[PDB]
Coordinates of C-alpha atoms and ligand atoms in Angstrom, one line a residue:
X1 CA -22.3 -15.5 -31.7
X2 CA -24.7 -13.0 -30.4
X3 CA -22.6 -11.3 -27.7
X4 CA -23.3 -7.5 -28.0
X5 CA -22.8 -6.0 -24.5
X6 CA -20.5 -3.4 -26.1
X7 CA -21.8 -1.0 -28.7
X8 CA -19.5 1.1 -31.0
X9 CA -19.6 4.2 -28.8
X10 CA -17.7 5.7 -25.9
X11 CA -20.4 5.6 -23.3
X12 CA -21.3 2.0 -23.9
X13 CA -17.6 0.9 -23.6
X14 CA -17.1 2.9 -20.4
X15 CA -20.3 1.3 -19.0
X16 CA -18.9 -2.2 -19.3
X17 CA -15.1 -2.2 -19.6
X18 CA -12.5 -2.4 -16.9
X19 CA -8.8 -2.4 -17.3
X20 CA -7.8 -6.0 -16.4
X21 CA -5.7 -6.9 -13.4
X22 CA -3.3 -9.0 -15.4
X23 CA -2.0 -5.8 -17.2
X24 CA -1.5 -4.1 -13.8
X25 CA 0.2 -7.2 -12.5
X26 CA 2.4 -7.8 -15.5
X27 CA 4.4 -4.5 -15.6
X28 CA 6.8 -5.5 -18.4
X29 CA 6.5 -6.5 -22.1
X30 CA 8.8 -6.9 -25.1
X31 CA 8.1 -5.0 -28.3
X32 CA 9.6 -6.5 -31.5
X33 CA 9.9 -4.2 -34.5
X34 CA 10.7 -6.5 -37.4
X35 CA 9.6 -6.3 -41.0
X36 CA 10.5 -5.4 -44.5
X37 CA 12.3 -2.3 -43.2
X38 CA 14.8 -4.7 -41.5
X39 CA 16.1 -5.7 -45.0
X40 CA 17.9 -2.4 -45.8
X41 CA 19.0 -2.3 -42.1
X42 CA 18.9 1.5 -42.1
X43 CA 17.2 1.5 -38.7
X44 CA 14.0 3.2 -39.7
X45 CA 10.5 1.9 -40.1
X46 CA 9.9 5.1 -42.1
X47 CA 12.2 4.0 -44.9
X48 CA 9.2 3.4 -47.1
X49 CA 7.9 6.9 -46.7
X50 CA 11.2 8.9 -47.1
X51 CA 12.7 6.8 -49.9
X52 CA 10.0 8.4 -52.1
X53 CA 10.8 12.0 -51.0
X54 CA 13.2 13.6 -53.5
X55 CA 16.3 14.8 -51.8
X56 CA 15.8 13.0 -48.5
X57 CA 18.9 11.3 -47.2
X58 CA 17.0 7.9 -47.4
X59 CA 16.0 8.7 -51.0
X60 CA 19.6 9.4 -51.9
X61 CA 20.8 6.3 -50.1
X62 CA 18.2 4.1 -51.8
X63 CA 18.8 5.4 -55.4
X64 CA 22.6 4.7 -55.1
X65 CA 22.3 1.4 -53.2
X66 CA 19.3 -0.2 -54.8
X67 CA 18.3 1.9 -57.8
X68 CA 15.9 4.4 -59.2
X69 CA 12.4 4.5 -57.6
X70 CA 10.8 3.4 -60.9
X71 CA 12.9 0.2 -60.9
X72 CA 13.4 -0.7 -57.2
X73 CA 10.5 0.2 -55.0
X74 CA 9.9 -0.6 -51.4
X75 CA 8.0 -3.7 -52.6
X76 CA 11.2 -5.0 -54.1
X77 CA 12.7 -5.6 -50.7
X78 CA 10.1 -8.2 -50.0
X79 CA 11.7 -11.1 -52.0
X80 CA 14.9 -10.5 -50.0
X81 CA 13.0 -10.8 -46.7
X82 CA 13.6 -14.5 -46.5
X83 CA 14.0 -14.7 -42.7
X84 CA 16.1 -17.9 -42.9
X85 CA 17.0 -17.7 -39.2
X86 CA 13.5 -16.8 -37.8
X87 CA 12.4 -19.2 -35.0
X88 CA 9.4 -18.3 -32.9
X89 CA 10.5 -20.5 -30.0
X90 CA 13.9 -19.0 -30.0
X91 CA 12.3 -15.5 -29.9
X92 CA 10.1 -16.4 -26.9
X93 CA 13.1 -17.8 -25.0
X94 CA 14.8 -14.4 -25.3
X95 CA 11.6 -12.6 -24.3
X96 CA 11.0 -15.0 -21.4
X97 CA 14.7 -14.6 -20.3
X98 CA 14.0 -10.9 -19.7
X99 CA 11.4 -11.5 -17.1
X100 CA 8.8 -9.8 -19.4
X101 CA 5.2 -11.1 -19.0
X102 CA 3.8 -10.3 -22.5
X103 CA 5.1 -9.9 -26.0
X104 CA 4.1 -7.5 -28.7
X105 CA 5.3 -8.3 -32.2
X106 CA 4.4 -5.9 -35.0
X107 CA 1.5 -7.5 -36.9
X108 CA 1.6 -4.7 -39.5
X109 CA 3.6 -1.5 -39.6
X110 CA 2.8 1.6 -41.7
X111 CA 4.4 0.1 -44.8
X112 CA 1.4 -2.0 -46.0
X113 CA 2.9 -5.4 -45.3
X114 CA 1.0 -7.9 -43.1
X115 CA 3.2 -10.1 -40.9
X116 CA 0.3 -12.7 -40.6
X117 CA -2.2 -14.8 -42.5
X118 CA -4.3 -12.0 -44.1
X119 CA -7.3 -12.8 -46.3
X120 CA -7.8 -9.4 -47.9
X121 CA -4.2 -8.1 -48.0
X122 CA -2.2 -10.2 -50.5
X123 CA 0.9 -8.2 -49.3
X124 CA 1.5 -10.6 -46.4
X125 CA 4.3 -12.8 -44.9
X126 CA 2.5 -16.1 -45.6
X127 CA 2.4 -15.5 -49.4
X128 CA 5.7 -13.5 -49.7
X129 CA 9.0 -12.9 -48.1
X130 CA 9.3 -15.2 -45.1
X131 CA 6.5 -17.4 -46.5
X132 CA 5.2 -18.2 -43.0
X133 CA 2.6 -16.9 -40.5
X134 CA 5.1 -15.0 -38.3
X135 CA 2.3 -13.8 -35.9
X136 CA 0.7 -17.3 -35.8
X137 CA 4.1 -19.0 -35.0
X138 CA 4.7 -16.4 -32.3
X139 CA 1.3 -16.9 -30.8
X140 CA 1.9 -20.7 -30.5
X141 CA 5.4 -20.1 -29.1
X142 CA 4.0 -17.6 -26.6
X143 CA 1.4 -20.1 -25.4
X144 CA 4.1 -22.8 -24.9
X145 CA 6.3 -20.2 -23.0
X146 CA 3.5 -19.4 -20.6
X147 CA 3.4 -15.6 -21.5
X148 CA 0.6 -13.4 -22.8
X149 CA 0.4 -12.6 -26.5
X150 CA -0.3 -9.1 -27.9
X151 CA 0.5 -7.4 -31.1
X152 CA 0.7 -4.0 -32.7
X153 CA -1.1 -2.4 -35.7
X154 CA 0.3 0.6 -37.5
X155 CA -1.9 0.1 -40.7
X156 CA -3.9 3.3 -40.2
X157 CA -1.0 5.4 -41.4
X158 CA -0.6 3.4 -44.6
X159 CA -3.5 5.6 -45.9
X160 CA -0.9 8.4 -46.5
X161 CA 2.5 6.9 -45.8
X162 CA 3.4 6.7 -49.5
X163 CA 2.2 10.2 -50.4
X164 CA 5.6 11.4 -51.6
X165 CA 5.7 8.6 -54.3
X166 CA 3.0 10.5 -56.3
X167 CA 5.2 13.7 -56.5
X168 CA 8.3 12.2 -58.3
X169 CA 8.6 9.3 -60.8
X170 CA 8.3 6.1 -58.9
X171 CA 6.3 2.8 -58.7
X172 CA 3.9 4.4 -56.2
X173 CA 2.3 6.1 -59.2
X174 CA 1.2 2.7 -60.5
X175 CA -2.0 2.8 -58.5
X176 CA -2.6 -1.0 -59.1
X177 CA 0.1 -1.8 -56.5
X178 CA -2.0 -2.0 -53.3
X179 CA 0.9 -2.2 -50.9
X180 CA 1.2 1.6 -51.2
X181 CA -2.2 2.3 -49.7
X182 CA -4.4 5.3 -50.5
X183 CA -1.6 7.7 -51.1
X184 CA -3.4 10.5 -49.3
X185 CA -1.8 13.5 -47.7
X186 CA -0.7 13.2 -44.0
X187 CA -3.3 14.5 -41.6
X188 CA -2.5 17.9 -40.2
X189 CA -2.0 18.7 -36.5
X190 CA 1.2 18.5 -34.5
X191 CA 1.7 15.8 -31.8
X192 CA -1.1 14.0 -30.1
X193 CA -4.2 15.8 -31.3
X194 CA -7.4 14.5 -32.9
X195 CA -7.4 17.6 -35.2
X196 CA -6.6 16.8 -38.8
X197 CA -7.1 20.0 -40.7
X198 CA -8.0 19.6 -44.3
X199 CA -6.5 16.1 -44.8
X200 CA -8.5 13.5 -43.0
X201 CA -5.7 10.9 -43.1
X202 CA -8.0 8.1 -44.2
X203 CA -10.9 7.4 -46.5
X204 CA -13.8 5.0 -46.9
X205 CA -11.6 2.2 -48.4
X206 CA -8.8 2.5 -45.8
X207 CA -11.4 2.6 -43.0
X208 CA -13.1 -0.6 -44.3
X209 CA -9.8 -2.3 -44.7
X210 CA -8.8 -1.3 -41.2
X211 CA -11.8 -3.2 -39.9
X212 CA -11.1 -6.2 -42.1
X213 CA -7.5 -6.1 -40.8
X214 CA -8.3 -5.8 -37.1
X215 CA -11.3 -8.3 -37.3
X216 CA -9.1 -11.0 -38.8
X217 CA -6.4 -10.4 -36.2
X218 CA -9.0 -10.7 -33.5
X219 CA -10.7 -13.8 -35.1
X220 CA -7.5 -15.7 -36.0
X221 CA -5.1 -15.0 -33.1
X222 CA -7.3 -13.8 -30.2
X223 CA -4.6 -11.4 -28.9
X224 CA -4.8 -10.3 -25.3
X225 CA -3.5 -6.8 -26.2
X226 CA -3.6 -4.7 -29.4
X227 CA -1.4 -1.6 -29.6
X228 CA -2.2 1.1 -32.2
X229 CA -0.2 3.9 -33.6
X230 CA -1.2 7.5 -33.3
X231 CA -3.5 8.4 -36.2
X232 CA -6.4 6.1 -35.0
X233 CA -7.3 9.0 -32.8
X234 CA -7.8 11.6 -35.6
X235 CA -11.4 12.7 -35.6
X236 CA -12.5 11.1 -38.9
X237 CA -11.2 7.7 -37.8
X238 CA -13.0 7.5 -34.4
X239 CA -16.3 6.0 -35.6
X240 CA -14.3 3.2 -37.3
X241 CA -12.1 2.7 -34.2
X242 CA -15.1 2.4 -31.9
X243 CA -16.5 -0.3 -34.2
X244 CA -13.2 -2.2 -33.7
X245 CA -13.2 -1.7 -29.9
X246 CA -16.8 -3.1 -29.5
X247 CA -16.0 -6.1 -31.7
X248 CA -12.7 -6.8 -29.7
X249 CA -14.3 -6.4 -26.2
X250 CA -17.3 -8.4 -27.2
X251 CA -15.1 -11.2 -28.6
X252 CA -13.0 -11.1 -25.4
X253 CA -16.2 -11.7 -23.3
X254 CA -16.7 -14.9 -25.3
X255 CA -13.1 -16.0 -24.9
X256 CA -13.2 -15.6 -21.1
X257 CA -10.1 -13.4 -21.5
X258 CA -9.7 -9.8 -20.5
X259 CA -8.0 -7.7 -23.1
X260 CA -6.1 -4.4 -23.5
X261 CA -6.2 -1.7 -26.2
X262 CA -3.4 0.8 -26.4
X263 CA -3.8 4.2 -28.0
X264 CA -1.7 7.4 -27.8
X265 CA -4.5 9.9 -27.6
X266 CA -8.1 10.5 -28.4
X267 CA -9.9 8.0 -26.2
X268 CA -10.8 8.1 -22.5
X269 CA -8.2 6.8 -20.0
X270 CA -10.8 4.3 -18.6
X271 CA -11.9 2.7 -21.9
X272 CA -8.3 1.9 -23.0
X273 CA -4.8 1.9 -21.7
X274 CA -2.9 5.0 -22.7
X275 CA 0.5 4.5 -24.2
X276 CA 2.4 7.8 -23.6
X277 CA 5.8 9.3 -23.2
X278 CA 7.1 9.6 -19.7
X279 CA 6.4 13.1 -18.5
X280 CA 8.5 15.2 -16.2
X281 CA 5.8 14.4 -13.6
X282 CA 6.6 12.8 -10.3
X283 CA 2.9 12.0 -10.0
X284 CA 1.2 8.6 -9.8
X285 CA -1.3 8.3 -12.6
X286 CA -4.8 7.2 -11.6
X287 CA -5.2 4.7 -14.4
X288 CA -2.7 2.1 -15.6
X289 CA -0.7 3.3 -18.6
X290 CA 2.2 2.1 -20.8
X291 CA 5.3 3.7 -22.2
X292 CA 7.7 2.4 -24.9
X293 CA 11.4 2.6 -25.5
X294 CA 14.0 0.7 -27.6
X295 CA 17.0 -1.2 -26.3
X296 CA 18.9 0.5 -29.2
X297 CA 20.1 4.1 -28.6
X298 CA 19.7 4.9 -32.3
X299 CA 16.8 2.8 -33.7
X300 CA 13.9 0.5 -33.0
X301 CA 14.3 -1.8 -36.0
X302 CA 17.7 -3.2 -36.7
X303 CA 20.6 -1.1 -38.1
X304 CA 24.2 -1.9 -38.6
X305 CA 26.3 0.0 -36.1
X306 CA 23.6 0.2 -33.4
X307 CA 24.8 1.2 -30.0
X308 CA 22.6 -0.5 -27.4
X309 CA 21.6 1.0 -24.0
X310 CA 22.9 -0.2 -20.7
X311 CA 20.7 -2.4 -18.5
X312 CA 21.3 0.1 -15.7
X313 CA 19.5 3.0 -17.3
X314 CA 16.7 0.8 -18.6
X315 CA 16.1 -0.8 -15.1
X316 CA 16.2 2.6 -13.4
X317 CA 13.5 3.9 -15.8
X318 CA 11.5 0.7 -15.5
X319 CA 11.4 1.1 -11.7
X320 CA 10.3 4.8 -12.0
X321 CA 7.6 3.8 -14.5
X322 CA 6.3 1.0 -12.3
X323 CA 6.2 3.3 -9.2
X324 CA 3.8 5.7 -11.1
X325 CA 1.4 3.0 -12.2
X326 CA 3.0 2.3 -15.6
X327 CA 4.1 -0.7 -17.6
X328 CA 7.3 -0.7 -19.7
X329 CA 7.1 -2.0 -23.3
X330 CA 10.7 -2.5 -24.3
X331 CA 11.7 -2.9 -27.9
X332 CA 14.2 -5.2 -29.6
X333 CA 15.0 -5.1 -33.3
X334 CA 16.1 -8.4 -34.9
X335 CA 18.2 -8.5 -38.0
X336 CA 16.4 -9.2 -41.3
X337 CA 17.2 -12.9 -41.2
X338 CA 15.3 -13.2 -37.9
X339 CA 18.4 -13.2 -35.5
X340 CA 18.1 -11.2 -32.3
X341 CA 21.6 -9.7 -31.8
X342 CA 23.8 -11.0 -29.0
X343 CA 23.9 -7.4 -27.6
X344 CA 20.2 -7.2 -27.2
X345 CA 20.0 -10.8 -25.9
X346 CA 22.5 -9.7 -23.2
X347 CA 20.6 -6.6 -22.2
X348 CA 17.3 -8.6 -21.8
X349 CA 19.2 -11.3 -19.9
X350 CA 20.6 -8.7 -17.5
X351 CA 17.1 -7.3 -16.8
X352 CA 15.8 -10.8 -16.3
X353 CA 18.5 -11.6 -13.8
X354 CA 17.7 -8.4 -11.9
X355 CA 14.0 -9.4 -11.9
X356 CA 14.9 -12.9 -10.6
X357 CA 16.2 -11.2 -7.5
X358 CA 14.0 -8.1 -7.2
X359 CA 10.7 -9.1 -9.0
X360 CA 8.8 -9.4 -5.7
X361 CA 8.7 -5.6 -5.7
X362 CA 7.6 -5.4 -9.3
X363 CA 5.2 -8.1 -10.4
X364 CA 1.7 -7.6 -9.0
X365 CA 2.7 -4.5 -7.2
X366 CA 0.7 -1.2 -7.1
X367 CA 1.8 2.4 -6.5
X368 CA 2.2 3.4 -2.8
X369 CA 1.0 6.7 -1.4
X370 CA 3.9 8.5 -3.3
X371 CA 6.1 7.3 -6.1
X372 CA 9.5 8.8 -5.4
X373 CA 11.8 10.9 -3.3
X374 CA 15.2 12.4 -3.9
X375 CA 16.9 14.9 -6.1
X376 CA 17.1 12.9 -9.4
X377 CA 16.2 20.4 -18.5
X378 CA 18.0 23.4 -20.1
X379 CA 21.5 22.7 -18.9
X380 CA 24.3 24.4 -20.9
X381 CA 26.9 21.7 -19.9
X382 CA 27.1 18.0 -19.9
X383 CA 26.4 17.4 -16.2
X384 CA 26.9 13.6 -16.3
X385 CA 24.1 13.4 -13.6
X386 CA 23.3 9.9 -12.4
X387 CA 20.9 8.7 -9.7
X388 CA 22.2 8.2 -6.2
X389 CA 21.0 5.9 -3.5
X390 CA 18.9 8.7 -2.1
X391 CA 16.8 8.6 -5.3
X392 CA 14.1 6.2 -4.1
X393 CA 11.0 4.8 -5.8
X394 CA 8.2 3.0 -4.0
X395 CA 5.8 0.1 -4.7
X396 CA 3.5 -1.9 -2.5
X397 CA 2.3 -5.5 -2.6
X398 CA 0.5 -7.6 0.0
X399 CA 0.8 -4.6 2.5
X400 CA 4.6 -4.7 2.1
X401 CA 6.4 -1.4 1.3
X402 CA 9.2 -1.7 -1.3
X403 CA 11.8 1.1 -1.3
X404 CA 14.0 0.9 -4.4
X405 CA 17.3 2.9 -4.4
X406 CA 18.4 3.7 -8.0
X407 CA 22.1 3.5 -7.0
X408 CA 24.3 2.0 -4.4
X409 CA 25.9 3.6 -1.3
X410 CA 28.3 2.3 1.3
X411 CA 26.5 4.4 3.9
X412 CA 22.8 4.9 4.6
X413 CA 19.7 6.6 3.2
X414 CA 16.9 8.2 5.1
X415 CA 13.4 7.5 3.6
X416 CA 11.9 11.0 3.9
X417 CA 8.4 9.7 3.0
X418 CA 8.3 7.9 6.3
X419 CA 9.0 11.2 8.2
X420 CA 6.9 11.5 11.4
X421 CA 4.8 14.3 9.9
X422 CA 3.4 11.9 7.3
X423 CA 2.8 9.1 9.8
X424 CA 0.4 8.0 12.6
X425 CA 1.5 5.1 14.8
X426 CA 4.0 3.8 12.2
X427 CA 6.1 1.0 13.6
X428 CA 8.7 -0.8 11.5
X429 CA 8.4 -4.6 11.9
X430 CA 11.3 -5.6 9.6
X431 CA 13.6 -4.4 6.8
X432 CA 15.5 -6.6 4.4
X433 CA 17.2 -6.1 1.1
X434 CA 15.9 -8.4 -1.6
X435 CA 18.6 -11.0 -2.5
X436 CA 20.7 -10.1 0.7
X437 CA 21.3 -12.6 3.5
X438 CA 22.6 -9.7 5.7
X439 CA 20.7 -8.2 8.5
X440 CA 19.7 -4.6 7.7
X441 CA 20.4 -2.1 10.5
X442 CA 17.7 0.6 10.6
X443 CA 16.2 3.2 12.9
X444 CA 13.1 5.4 12.7
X445 CA 13.7 9.1 13.2
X446 CA 11.6 12.2 13.0
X447 CA 13.2 12.9 9.6
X448 CA 12.3 9.4 8.3
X449 CA 13.5 5.8 8.3
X450 CA 17.3 5.6 8.3
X451 CA 18.5 2.5 6.5
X452 CA 22.1 1.3 6.4
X453 CA 23.0 -0.5 3.1
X454 CA 24.5 -4.0 3.6
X455 CA 28.1 -4.8 2.7
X456 CA 27.6 -6.8 -0.5
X457 CA 25.5 -5.9 -3.6
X458 CA 22.9 -8.6 -4.3
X459 CA 22.5 -7.1 -7.8
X460 CA 23.7 -4.2 -9.8
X461 CA 21.5 -1.3 -11.1
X462 CA 18.9 -0.9 -8.4
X463 CA 18.4 -2.2 -4.8
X464 CA 15.2 -3.0 -3.1
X465 CA 14.4 -2.7 0.6
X466 CA 11.4 -4.7 1.6
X467 CA 9.7 -3.0 4.6
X468 CA 7.1 -4.5 6.9
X469 CA 5.3 -1.8 8.9
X470 CA 2.1 -1.0 10.6
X471 CA 0.5 2.4 10.9
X472 CA -1.1 4.9 8.6
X473 CA 0.9 7.1 6.1
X474 CA -0.2 10.1 4.0
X475 CA 1.6 11.4 1.0
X476 CA 2.7 15.0 0.7
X477 CA -0.3 16.9 -0.8
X478 CA -0.5 17.9 -4.5
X479 CA -2.2 21.2 -5.4
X480 CA -4.0 21.8 -8.7
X481 CA -5.6 25.1 -9.9
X482 CA -9.4 25.1 -10.2
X483 CA -11.5 28.3 -10.7
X484 CA -11.7 30.3 -7.5
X485 CA -10.0 27.5 -5.5
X486 CA -7.6 24.6 -5.5
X487 CA -7.9 20.9 -5.6
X488 CA -5.9 18.9 -3.0
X489 CA -4.9 15.3 -3.7
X490 CA -3.3 12.9 -1.3
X491 CA -3.0 9.1 -1.0
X492 CA -3.4 7.4 2.4
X493 CA -2.2 3.9 3.2
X494 CA -3.4 1.9 6.2
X495 CA -0.7 -0.7 6.9
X496 CA -2.5 -1.8 10.1
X497 CA -4.4 -5.1 10.3
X498 CA -7.5 -3.1 11.4
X499 CA -9.6 -0.4 9.7
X500 CA -8.5 3.1 10.5
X501 CA -10.2 6.5 10.6
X502 CA -8.2 9.4 9.4
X503 CA -9.0 13.1 9.2
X504 CA -7.5 15.3 6.5
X505 CA -7.7 19.1 6.8
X506 CA -6.7 21.6 4.1
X507 CA -6.6 25.3 5.3
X508 CA -6.1 27.6 2.3
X509 CA -6.4 31.4 2.8
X510 CA -8.3 30.8 6.0
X511 CA -10.8 28.5 4.4
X512 CA -10.9 25.1 6.1
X513 CA -12.1 21.9 4.5
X514 CA -12.0 18.6 6.4
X515 CA -12.8 15.1 5.4
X516 CA -12.9 12.0 7.6
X517 CA -11.9 8.8 5.7
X518 CA -12.4 5.2 6.8
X519 CA -9.3 3.4 5.3
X520 CA -9.8 -0.4 5.3
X521 CA -7.1 -2.6 6.8
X522 CA -4.0 -3.1 4.6
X523 CA -5.4 -0.8 1.9
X524 CA -4.8 2.6 0.3
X525 CA -6.8 5.2 -1.5
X526 CA -6.9 8.5 -3.2
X527 CA -8.4 11.4 -1.3
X528 CA -9.4 14.7 -3.0
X529 CA -10.5 17.9 -1.4
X530 CA -11.3 21.3 -2.6
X531 CA -10.8 24.7 -1.0
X532 CA -13.0 27.6 -2.1
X533 CA -12.6 31.4 -2.3
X534 CA -8.9 31.3 -3.4
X535 CA -8.1 34.7 -5.0
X536 CA -4.7 33.8 -6.3
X537 CA -3.3 30.3 -6.8
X538 CA 0.2 31.6 -6.9
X539 CA -0.1 33.7 -3.7
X540 CA -2.2 31.2 -1.6
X541 CA -1.3 30.3 1.9
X542 CA -1.5 26.5 2.4
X543 CA -1.5 24.3 5.5
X544 CA -2.3 20.6 5.4
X545 CA -3.0 18.4 8.5
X546 CA -3.1 14.6 9.0
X547 CA -5.1 13.9 12.2
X548 CA -4.4 17.5 13.3
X549 CA -0.6 17.1 12.8
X550 CA 0.9 19.6 10.3
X551 CA 2.1 17.7 7.2
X552 CA 2.8 20.5 4.8
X553 CA 2.8 24.3 4.6
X554 CA 4.1 26.4 1.7
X555 CA 6.7 27.9 4.0
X556 CA 9.0 29.0 1.1
Ligands
LIG1 CA1 20.9 2.6 -11.3

């Protein structure tokens, strides 16, 4: 007791918190959406909300399949949630087989039902349904498997999730049933915004219970990561959430473990790990981030008739995410009895076999100077576009450069990011394809590093060239509009064994800014510059120089 480095405010957290290296090193986790919503097997965690909305397809489905809302409520699925085939060790063997490094079971979704040993919430999996501590058994299994344990909380939305049950006859109108939460209106605001309009989305009781909920998860299971759904960022909840963050980060100091909080918006990108959709951006993000997707094409939780995705598209996206400083949190949805389907076991096993061969380029890597090259919205056709071998993503680790082609070719590729205009004194020492015993034939040209693919595929899906090089490389510059000027961003990598001095020069509309940078041996860094007196960002004339060699000019 006594540890109080962190106070429940933003400036205190930012003063003392750093995103841990294990998260950056890990890259890949498995999300497991499993709960009472698995029983109807409709494929929606929002079953509990829409079943009470008169006329909604789920409402109509429920009334015919299970009965009127006054006789069969969401709570009445819970006795059926027996989980006769749940086995935590079996789950962890599937997770471990994927090559993932952490696991994120759902500790509590929006529906009010705790999947763990809760003291205040009598709607829990120890007392009801499975009659076991699902989260506790998964924590023990994860320790034995040698992975890191996280979990997700979606309880904040329980404050309003059952609001439609008050508008039509149903058991939600019996306000003594606490599973159904505060029955408030959903907060206003579209998408990821802290604005809530005239409905706060929480109240005093739900805020206090959120602290009881997160405190007991922290105290009982000491998770290394806690993921939260989107409404914890609405303005009225932020004081409560900062109290949670301080308690979690202070506890973690005592545990001698560094921890991660995920949120979708509302909090600084340095005091937590953003969990965000993948943009259209090719850019490397400065801070580590996470993005989530399901193995199922249709759903996250289990539904009959699910069509699962192919390992190829998942792996291609995974590599793209990793090249841009992201982690992939990939979801499986077990059946209500606790069985992970053969199809999803197979997808995870294929990813794991890919990582067995190619993981050197993934685990522990960091973004290079630039994440991607190659050709890769509103199309009024089905174009059937796929990646080609010329679509390349980059990572670096231990001064090695990994160039990952997202498809195969019988010919060659030319790595354009190693074109001579980006390079000073670059010499290639070796090139190999991970998993290949064949010697790679390659040649440096002015246009880049030409690399001939070997004869046999070591793996499907994506193919890694490991490149050992010396020299200094700069990325192509990025331009961002600032008032009366422009911000220029590059990354520089010194692959030499000795420190290097580099000069960058941005000449925009005749205004010249220069910076000299000492880049430590076998290291890389962001460099930002700013040109002034730019009348028009769209009409600007731009030249960028790397040690007085022209790297870029907006020629077209
Ligand atoms: Ca591919």
